Amino acid sequence: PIVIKFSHVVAENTPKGQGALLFKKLVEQRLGGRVEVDVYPNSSLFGDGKEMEALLLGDVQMLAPSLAKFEQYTRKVQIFDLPFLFDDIQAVDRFQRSPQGRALLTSMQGKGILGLAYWHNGMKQLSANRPLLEPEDARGLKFRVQASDVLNEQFRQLRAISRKMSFAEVYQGLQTGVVNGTENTWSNYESQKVNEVQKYFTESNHGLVDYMVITNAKFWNGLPADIREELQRIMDEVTVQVNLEAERLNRDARQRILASGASEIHTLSPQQRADWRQAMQPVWQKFRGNVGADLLQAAEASNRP
């Protein structure tokens, strides 16, 4: 039996958590015991950063990290972190399906990482212990960000303080005041109960959390061809399921946060959104050389159906 250990940092009741569990179920139902799958959620086996070290070492065989967590392996995936680049997940999906977007799945093959698929989670919103209605509202705040130079600079541009922290540490960081605010999808906020430590949310859709399903190129390329292709077909089916569940789980997450009564959500007006974009988009100039004109052109073109 070939064992595939799939580690991740999110709760089970999420797009990625359900996706990993579906992959395991379909492998069990279709590969007759030739492949077995173990799933380790919520940083139970490996958390941020460590997971990739383990992937390269062979302590794990499959991951699906946020596209914001690959700067140590390539700087091309940074495109997904640029604020307000993608209007919505439909635009990002279009970019991901472009020749360029597909090519990015192999951007790290030279470091031993193979991308197998993109999984959607959703757009990012803002959270803090004070209201965030106008960009000046973020000044002085300490925001937890994923380990991303783009996201670090995003809040630096708003005259705020950025703290790169592993996802598992967000709740405690906010409860203890190491950080005062953050950014994430409704699913991640509710699934991790972070609304209990954030009284104010702003629906800004200023970015997104999407994932690249990845594996160790040596493990995957060493699989029997029939098994590899079958696993890829199953992954393709799982991707559709994740992408469909993602939008609805995020909708349910927002409703449960609003129902809580312990947190408020302000939705930005078109004009407010534009002012936040005008204030944050200057960060793009710092990374344009890394991503390149072509990728930026393709990403901007993805906003036009």
UniProtKB/TrEMBL annotation:
GO terms for cellular component: outer membrane-bounded periplasmic space. Keywords: Signal, Transport. It comes from the Bacteria. Succinate binds at K16, K69, R144, N184, N188, Y211. GO terms for biological process: C4-dicarboxylate transport; transmembrane transport. (S)-malate binds at K16, K69, R144, N184, N188, Y211. Belongs to the bacterial solute-binding protein 7 family. NCBIfam families: dctP, TRAP_S1. This is Probable C4-dicarboxylate-binding periplasmic protein. It comes from Pseudomonas aeruginosa (strain ATCC 15692 / DSM 22644 / CIP 104116 / JCM 14847 / LMG 12228 / 1C / PRS 101 / PAO1).
